Paper text:
We soaked [name]‐AMP crystals with 3‐HAA and obtained electron density for 3‐HAA and AMP. There is residual electron density suggesting that we could fit a second molecule of 3‐HAA (3‐HAA2) bound adjacent to the 3‐HAA1 molecule; the orientation suggested that the hydroxyl not the amine would attack the 3‐HAA1‐adenylate.
We show [name] catalyzes ester not, as previously reported, amide formation; the amide is a shunt product.
Residue numbers in the entry:
A (entry chain A): 4 to 436
B (entry chain B): 1 to 436
The structure:
Amino acid sequence: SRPELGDWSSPAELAELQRSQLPRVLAQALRSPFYAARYRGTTPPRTADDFAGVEVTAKQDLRDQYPFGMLAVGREHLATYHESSGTAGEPTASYYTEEDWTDLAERFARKWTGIHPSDTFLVRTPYGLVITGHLAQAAGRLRGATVVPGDARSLATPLSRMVRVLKTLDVTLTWCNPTEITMLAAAAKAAGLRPDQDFPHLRAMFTAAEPLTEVRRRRLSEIWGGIPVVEEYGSTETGTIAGQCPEGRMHLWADRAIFEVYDPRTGTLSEAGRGQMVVTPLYRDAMPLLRYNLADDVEVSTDPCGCGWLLPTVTVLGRAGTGHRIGPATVTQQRLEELVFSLPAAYEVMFWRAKAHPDVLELEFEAPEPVRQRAVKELGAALDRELGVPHRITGLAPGTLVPAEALTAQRDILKARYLFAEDEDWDKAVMYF
Amino acid sequence: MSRSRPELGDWSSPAELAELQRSQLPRVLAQALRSPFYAARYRGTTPPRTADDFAGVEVTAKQDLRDQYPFGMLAVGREHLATYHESSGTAGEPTASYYTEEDWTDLAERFARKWTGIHPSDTFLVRTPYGLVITGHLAQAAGRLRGATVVPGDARSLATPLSRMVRVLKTLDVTLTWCNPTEITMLAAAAKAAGLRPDQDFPHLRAMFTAAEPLTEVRRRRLSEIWGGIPVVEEYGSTETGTIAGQCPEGRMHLWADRAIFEVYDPRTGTLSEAGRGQMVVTPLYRDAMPLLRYNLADDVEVSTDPCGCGWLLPTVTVLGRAGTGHRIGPATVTQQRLEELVFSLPAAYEVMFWRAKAHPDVLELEFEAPEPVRQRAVKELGAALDRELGVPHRITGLAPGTLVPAEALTAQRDILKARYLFAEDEDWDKAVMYF
Ligand SMILES: Nc1ncnc2c1ncn2[C@@H]1O[C@H](COP(=O)(O)O)[C@@H](O)[C@H]1O
Ligand SMILES: Nc1ncnc2c1ncn2[C@@H]1O[C@H](COP(=O)(O)O)[C@@H](O)[C@H]1O
Ligand SMILES: Nc1c(O)cccc1C(=O)O
Ligand SMILES: Nc1c(O)cccc1C(=O)O
Ligand SMILES: Nc1c(O)cccc1C(=O)O
Ligand SMILES: Nc1c(O)cccc1C(=O)O
Ligand SMILES: [Mg+2]
Ligand SMILES: [Mg+2]
Ligand SMILES: [Mg+2]
Ligand SMILES: [Zn+2]
Ligand SMILES: [Zn+2]
């Protein structure tokens, strides 16, 4: 019913797998109050050729239509409801039928390392309204992997507990953002476990949600013993839209969506190049999207890649591509990250932050005491040689940017209690979290 | 014809129920021996295989589940597990439980035994944790079994503060909630703080499912009244057992005895019986991954086989738990359950929801929040109730709202941020790496 990797042998065959779905997709879209309103008074697009004419759908549209302005089915058919991360003030609602969920789960499950019944899969992203935890769990169950629901941002599951679970359950796969990969490495050391040796069953780490350079991705692999760090690109509104190949580039899942690159200035859409990621999902019923602009800054290739899936590649600059002018130079987060994570691994520089002033780059990072002044000097020389920005670099003690208590605090999972003995803490009566 | 597990109405007498149970025990006892824990227990001797042998079977204690952490109780290949969970309470001494896909169908069916129904027309806010504990996953699996739209509210997540849950309750026309009874009061207080009346401004809310705390009928009825007189539907369960009892329309919880053998353990005499007062013992009948033979939850319960007005033909259960622990204060014994009945007997217009007490050898110290006009009435009436019902000496203090339950818990909104490393000059770079 839905295409599989290897169902097309050329870009022309891929294009027809897409084109054949557009009548159903355009018919389903018009069922939603948003698109019915958009094409009121005129004749709607109904054929594949008409799709070239279709107007972009912006984030602002999804926000204006809160909660169910984008809904194309009866609510009786919805399986789950979700809201996006970012501004709580302007919620972005997304919702999925059971059949919508099978497409979502299949796309996440396209992990070049596999997800198997022999896997124990720690899901360490949030389950609170956002889709990310539910998505990894649904893929885990689709493939028969034992799912350990770690959740994230939950008082029930601090880092100390996740490290104990990683070790004691022989976890084989993780799902968490790239910062959480470093947070778990720092929490592992604090629990007396070496990330590079003491987790012999950990075979791959799945990651997304942040702009991630190859330089940082490779260091995260090295920190955890040289195991694969497998990136994907997605959103609450779209699910997974690209996944890594064994060579380390992300390929667009174009059999399940039409991908286009939007120039915001000219307002023109092309199938490759530099611009804003536009997505038309092909296998949705509940929340149809026509050329939804994620507004992520991306470069799409279509270059023949060494893996040979016959899919375009994508690099996600995102916000990390926003140039800040500092004296004569433009610095991006992506370029700073490459310099920070080019420091030797033995310096253990993982946690850092920078502020762009009009005149100077202020940058702080944690490094153990013996190596700190080497690290400050080498990062300074790297910035001089690569950017020529003025900089004030400060090395900090570990425990300064990422406090020791975040790495080691354990928290009992209490329920409300009302009657206490004299020697008990009655501060946990009603505020027990 | 073609469901493999029993449903309400498949037995017409206690004798028929008993045979539905006994017929599963050879499979259950064979599966139990496959686990390292039971194979070790019955090493060197003859293991139990038949129904008659079950009378002989030794209790499995919580301390056994802790000693066996993580997979000493595992009876199948790890390839067959769907999910892994750990219990609430002490993080220092974890209890693991785990379930195959088929184990999950039994769990989901038991939660779904809600006398109010769960239908495709329902929008179901799941407001218990998804972090290792089973509760969020269990409500979500039942929601999907019955076709209800599941809103994963999670609980104890920085992503879902009460202000956001109130907005969701209202704007999505939520029909069903699942959360502990304290969370029901927290949501009511957050609604008021947002300028919404729980008793009128949520017209689509038709029932509230609850568990996890000892809950008196007096408190349960007040929680119903606060939210407009809608049903508050209780169940009783544990991470290791799933749902073991659920409420009937008359307001008592019935044991799901078609899916487990329930026994009451007297710790003093060390005897197991099918009814009475003591510690809840459970033998689940429809699980493969983590077989349990007479697992003692150690919850303090009263099981009655007395007929209820509902007519389901299952024994009822009351869960005293910790709230049944007598603290002696001179000649009087005070229980949480009895204090709760007095606090929630105060008139609803006084708005007393949040309280706490400490047992001193000489005096009961009790504090609660009440609006200013009514506070002195509340202090006096609760004092007279304690004098009349317990005769304990008491120091009762009424507190300003925002004192036990801060305003920021009820109204604070929190952006769901991702890590950022490079900031413009005017931004807060404190959310770089600690972005929670
Ligand atoms: N691999 C990735 N690299 C960079 N940014 C990503 C990646 N995956 C997700 N994102 C970002 O996360 C957003 C998803 O937002 P949300 O739907 O709120 O979870 C995307 O639109 C991107 O801005
Ligand atoms: N309806 C209920 N009434 C009283 N206590 C309950 C109820 N439901 C659950 N519990 C308690 O919560 C425990 C479950 O603990 P856990 O497995 O850690 O979630 C039970 O063993 C009881 O102590
Ligand atoms: N994927 C995520 C999201 O959507 C929101 C917050 C956190 C994450 C993550 O990967 O941890
Ligand atoms: N990165 C994501 C993904 O791959 C799937 C779904 C959501 C996200 C996200 O960034 O939140
Ligand atoms: N059900 C719960 C649990 O098992 C642990 C902690 C909290 C709850 C709850 O109902 O909120
Ligand atoms: N309270 C619970 C329930 O009702 C079902 C399953 C588990 C629990 C729990 O408290 O762990
Ligand atoms: Mg529905
Ligand atoms: Mg498995
Ligand atoms: Mg328990
Ligand atoms: Zn490739
Ligand atoms: Zn009854």
